Amino acid sequence: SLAPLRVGILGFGGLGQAAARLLAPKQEMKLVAVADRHGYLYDADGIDVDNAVQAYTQQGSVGKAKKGQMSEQSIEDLIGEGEVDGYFLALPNLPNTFMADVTRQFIASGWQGVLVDALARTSAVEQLITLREDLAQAGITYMTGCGATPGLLTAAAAIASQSFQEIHQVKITFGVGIANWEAYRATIREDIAHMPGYNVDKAQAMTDAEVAALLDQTNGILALEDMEHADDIMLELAGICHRDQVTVGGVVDTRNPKKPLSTHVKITGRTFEGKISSHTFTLGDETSMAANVCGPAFGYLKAGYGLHRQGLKGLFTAADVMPKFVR
Amino acid sequence: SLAPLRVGILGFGGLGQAAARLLAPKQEMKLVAVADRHGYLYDADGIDVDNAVQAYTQQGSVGKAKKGQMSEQSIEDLIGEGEVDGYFLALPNLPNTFMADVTRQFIASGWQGVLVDALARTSAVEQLITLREDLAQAGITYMTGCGATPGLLTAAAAIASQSFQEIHQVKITFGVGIANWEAYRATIREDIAHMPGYNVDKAQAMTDAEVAALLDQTNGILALEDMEHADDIMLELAGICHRDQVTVGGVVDTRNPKKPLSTHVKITGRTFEGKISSHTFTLGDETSMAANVCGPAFGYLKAGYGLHRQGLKGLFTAADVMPKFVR
Ligand SMILES: NC(=O)c1ccc[n+]([C@@H]2O[C@H](COP(=O)([O-])OP(=O)(O)OC[C@H]3O[C@@H](n4cnc5c(N)ncnc54)[C@H](O)[C@@H]3O)[C@@H](O)[C@H]2O)c1
Ligand SMILES: NC(=O)c1ccc[n+]([C@@H]2O[C@H](COP(=O)([O-])OP(=O)(O)OC[C@H]3O[C@@H](n4cnc5c(N)ncnc54)[C@H](O)[C@@H]3O)[C@@H](O)[C@H]2O)c1
Ligand SMILES: C[C@@H](N)[C@H](CCCCCC(=O)O)CC(=O)O
Ligand SMILES: C[C@@H](N)[C@H](CCCCCC(=O)O)CC(=O)O
């Protein structure tokens, strides 16, 4: 509260906006920086969040806000100008290489500090693994898969694993309730890509009408099984189990602000007594996706600052570190 | 497996013996050292666990084993002789000052490395807090409350808290099934002290007959509510909630190797959207107390080594650190 972390959000959609509302009441963390595709907003006194959302929703960028600046290289521009201790990357991974590219920008920028993502795909995370040395060398502490899943649920699994001699499966079943699907376009596009008939490239090309059409077949309900989720590699990287033992599935109701099922992770293992058993970590039906994603993200930004401060640089997952409650 | 942690166990009761069985199949960790009240056993090739248990059970000390040495200052002696990277303190906290005293021994010993306890009482932990600077200065990384509760459940709570703006309660309800109460004498004596009619001093003085008599009133079933559990201060120390928001209760069936209820922690908070909700982390009914205690203990020894290695010394709780799966 005397020396507060100055933090930025890149991307101002469902997650970016929700991140900004979540940081509003904090005293240890101050939102100084937001960027979207076409513009950015910096204010070392703290972002008027209501104004940044008004600007974004009605004029299509935060660059159109009281303090905003338009730019077709918003993040590139914001990096040089902004005195910022850590950024949350609330961005799409469209294409599957985009997060890595922005991270490359940050590496080349010379900039030092903490980065956090809520990256979902094993493949997207592997691209970030590509950069783990570069990351260390540029003096960046990078916290990857630090949302809900990956993130909170992965970390719960890493903690639960401690009871066992060998891990057998980590099963994630998530439920999401959103009032309409446009609230989290990329989240829902990235979901449709996981589906049987589809991929990343197809999902990207699809029109808002084609998405509503698909959704309409099932009354707004995406059932997703064995999705390509980075929970798998993070748990492997922590040496808890092989990625093949990690399985991620769920149900998105896109016409319903209420969760269609209780999000839970089941951790199955054999104890040193040769008994086989399962721990269950279940989320409260009234913890929203945004809460379950952005809450851990900033806890991981803080833990990441902890690590940065004792000169720890490189790539950490939600599985590797205890996030620190942000006040 | 090339460079394995050499670890010791102080105390060879229910937990100490179970610790030794748990470390048997590990390749990253080698049991080199065990101490009980009257003797100790060192063997830098690894303890024959079956022999140490035979010696203890039938001749009353591990000092009576193939390699053993009798001593009425077993731990004092074992410290000087033993090349050991980390110790698990499987000891009673009778009297409520005993853990602190042994820790003082370790401080005065000059010895460097990692210590772990499964300490249960807020008061016992406060005594260890007394020593946090001494601990740092002697070059010891000390992991306190790193069993089941405190420990695993506390850590699960710290992770679950991340979804929330404010924490309202952490409620722990534990179930324990043991075939007879003498398996974990001090555990059960420490329990009876928490009870309404009793205290530490009374519990200590009580005879094995007086304990069986008490237990016999309720057919071997201790119901315990609002116990003085260090979960409370650890969560406060991690700045997640005030100790008064943390509440620990449970049921020990002392005539039943099956859990009388499913151990769980409920974490209640308000999200940034002003919604109030609860996460639940439940343990599998076939994870034993020993598994749920010793598994996290050694995960925390390893994490503690991690911290020691980057020159981090002092007092950490299960709430402050991600334990590392031991292989
Ligand atoms: N880990 C988890 O638990 C978790 C959960 C949900 C979503 N996610 C992921 O989080 C990401 C964000 O999803 P969302 O629903 O907030 O997305 P969204 O489509 O609602 O918003 C994307 C935002 O990115 C902005 N942006 C900023 N700079 C950009 C640039 N240079 N190019 C393109 N867009 C730019 C856009 O303007 C837009 O505001 C997705 O990839 C999603 O899969 C992770
Ligand atoms: N954190 C948790 O989840 C958790 C759970 C269960 C028990 N515990 C705690 O763990 C502790 C161990 O309980 P237990 O059931 O293994 O105890 P126990 O009574 O079965 O064994 C105690 C052992 O301490 C040994 N010991 C070694 N050196 C000693 C010395 N100098 N003085 C006295 N005894 C000495 C005794 O010889 C004996 O082997 C208790 O304090 C208990 O409350 C914690
Ligand atoms: C966007 C959804 N399809 C997933 C939701 C994970 C968060 C939900 C957990 C909860 O709040 O219960 C996350 C993802 O897919 O990356
Ligand atoms: C000994 C008992 N009275 C408690 C049991 C905590 C571990 C049980 C959790 C479980 O395995 O379900 C621990 C304690 O009291 O310190």
Swiss-Prot record, chains A, B:
The reaction(s) this protein catalyses: (8S)-8-amino-7-oxononanoate + L-lysyl-[protein] + CO2 = (S)-2-amino-6-oxohexanoyl-[protein] + (7R,8S)-8-amino-7-(carboxyamino)nonanoate + 2 H(+); (8S)-8-amino-7-oxononanoate + L-lysyl-[protein] + NADPH + H(+) = N(6)-[(2S,3R)-2-amino-8-carboxyoctan-3-yl]-L-lysyl-[protein] + NADP(+) + H2O; N(6)-[(2S,3R)-2-amino-8-carboxyoctan-3-yl]-L-lysyl-[protein] + CO2 + NADP(+) + H2O = (S)-2-amino-6-oxohexanoyl-[protein] + (7R,8S)-8-amino-7-(carboxyamino)nonanoate + NADPH + 3 H(+); (8S)-8-amino-7-oxononanoate + L-lysyl-[protein] + NADH + H(+) = N(6)-[(2S,3R)-2-amino-8-carboxyoctan-3-yl]-L-lysyl-[protein] + NAD(+) + H2O
InterPro entries per UniProt: BioU-like (IPR044262), Glu/Leu/Phe/Val/Trp_DH_C (IPR006096), NAD(P)-bd_dom_sf (IPR036291)
| Active-site residues, as the UniProt record annotates them | 120, 190, 194
Annotated GO molecular function terms are: NAD binding; NADP binding; oxidoreductase activity; transaminase activity
The catalytic activity of this protein is classed by the Enzyme Commission as: 2.6.1.121
Q: One GO biological process from the UniProt record?
A: biotin biosynthetic process
Q: Does the keyword Lipid biosynthesis belong to this entry?
A: no
Phenotype upon knockout is: Loss of biotin biosynthesis.
Q: What's the reported outcome of changing residue 231 to N?
A: Decreased product formation, able to weakly form a BioU-DAN conjugate
Q: Which UniProt keywords apply?
A: Aminotransferase, Biotin biosynthesis, NAD, NADP, Nucleotide-binding, Transferase
UniProt pathway: Cofactor biosynthesis; biotin biosynthesis
Which positions does UniProt annotate for NAD(+) binding?
Answer: 11-15, 56, 186-187
**Residues that bear Allysine:** 120
Q: Specify the domain of life of the species encoding this protein.
A: Bacteria
Q: Pfam families from the entry?
A: ELFV_dehydrog
Gene3D superfamilies linked: NAD(P)-binding Rossmann-like Domain
Other noteworthy facts: In canonical biotin synthesis a pimeloyl-conjugate is transformed into biotin by the subsequent action of BioF, BioA, BioD and BioB. This enzyme replaces BioA and performs the first half-reaction of BioD. In Synechocystis BioD acts on the product of this enzyme.
So what does this one do?
Answer: A 'suicide' enzyme that participates in biotin synthesis. Catalyzes the formation of (S)-8-amino-7-oxononanoate (DAN-carbamic acid) from (7R,8S)-8-amino-7-(carboxyamino)nonanoate (DAN), a function equivalent to the cannonical BioA reaction and the first half-reaction of BioD. The cellular requirement for biotin is thought be low enough that this single turnover enzyme supplies a sufficient amount of the cofactor.
User: What HAMAP family does this protein's entry cite?
Assistant: BioU (MF_00852)
Domain note for this entry?
Has 2 domains; discontinuous domain I (residues 1-149 and 291-331) forms a nucleotide-binding domain while domain II (residues 150-290) binds substrate.
Similarity comment: family membership: Belongs to the BioU family.
Q: How does it assemble?
A: Monomer.
State the name under which the record lists this protein.
(S)-8-amino-7-oxononanoate synthase BioU
The gene that this protein is the product of is bioU
